[PDB]
Amino acid sequence: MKKRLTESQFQEAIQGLEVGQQTIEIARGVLVDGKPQATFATSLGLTRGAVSQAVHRVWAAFEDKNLPEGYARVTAVLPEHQAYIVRKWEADAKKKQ
Amino acid sequence: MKKRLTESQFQEAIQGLEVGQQTIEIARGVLVDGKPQATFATSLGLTRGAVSQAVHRVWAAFEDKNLPEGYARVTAVLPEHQAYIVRKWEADA
DNA sequence: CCAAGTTTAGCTAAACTTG
DNA sequence: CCAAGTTTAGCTAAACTTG
């Protein structure tokens, strides 16, 4: 019920995004129009898991585009201490609330 | 190519991994016994994609465990400069 | 408790990649 | 070409989480 976009936010999310029209329609109805995921499961004959994933794809896409300014995602295999530091960097940024 | 394992690496690989006996059989058949994926596609009535995925789940598992002692894969969203630092570190291998 | 939503190994399609 | 293998959005099952 919580977790939502504007049309403008939504349009950003789906720009470039490689997904079909069903996914788009489901995500808009849920994220923009505040309708329950369950009415799309029912109406489309789909499990609730499928609908949660559809909504998730558009959600995730929006987040990947709204990372704090200047910030980058990074992944790497690191030795223990260097890995610990990344954990601490993040965790100290989470305990910045 | 062509990626392969002993039955002992294979076991190390899948330890702690949630994986069914079918994925196990396909992965063993291909990575240990050296058989081709197409074999299992027919014998089990699966698509090539499914077999290709089965082999992948185990291979990725092995990869994560043949990593050097203490080494860990990590992911984060950081300020560029800290990301720069992580890339610099990660290059050092 | 309840009902809605989440998660993840594992499947398909079908376009793509490799040798 | 073709044979075999890769990729990834989309789906399920059904345990688990959330409100």
Numbering used by the authors:
A (entry chain A): 1 to 97
B (entry chain B): 1 to 93
Please give the exact wording used by the authors of the publication that reports this structure.
KorA was crystallized in the presence of the operator OA. Structures from two of these were determined. Both show the DBDs of the protein symmetrically placed about the DNA axis. In contrast, the orientation of the CTD differs in the two crystal structures. In contrast to most proteins containing a helix-turn-helix motif, that bind to one face of the DNA; the two DBDs of KorA straddle the DNA, with helix 4 of the two subunits binding to opposite faces of the major groove. In each operator half site, five of the six consensus base pairs form direct hydrogen bonds to a protein side chain. In addition R48, at the beginning of helix 4, binds to Guanine 5 O6, but an alternative conformation of its sidechain is also seen in one half site, binding to phosphate 4. G49 is positioned so that its Cα atom is in van der Waal's contact with Thymine 7-O4. This restricts both the amino acid identity and the base, as other bases, including Cytosine, would cause a steric clash. The hydroxyl group of T47 forms a water-mediated contact with Adenine 13 in both chains. The remaining protein–DNA contacts are to the phosphate groups, including many from residues 18–23, outside the helix-turn-helix motif.
Gene expression in the IncP-1 plasmids is stringently controlled by a network of four global repressors, KorA, KorB, TrbA and KorC interacting cooperatively. KorA is a 101-amino acid, homodimeric, protein with an N-terminal DNA-binding domain (DBD), containing a helix-turn-helix motif, and a C-terminal dimerization region, joined by a linker of four amino acids. In this study, we have determined the structures of the free KorA repressor and two complexes each bound to a 20-bp palindromic DNA duplex containing its consensus operator sequence. The structure of KorA consists of two domains, joined by a highly flexible, four amino acid linker, which retains its mobility even when bound to DNA.
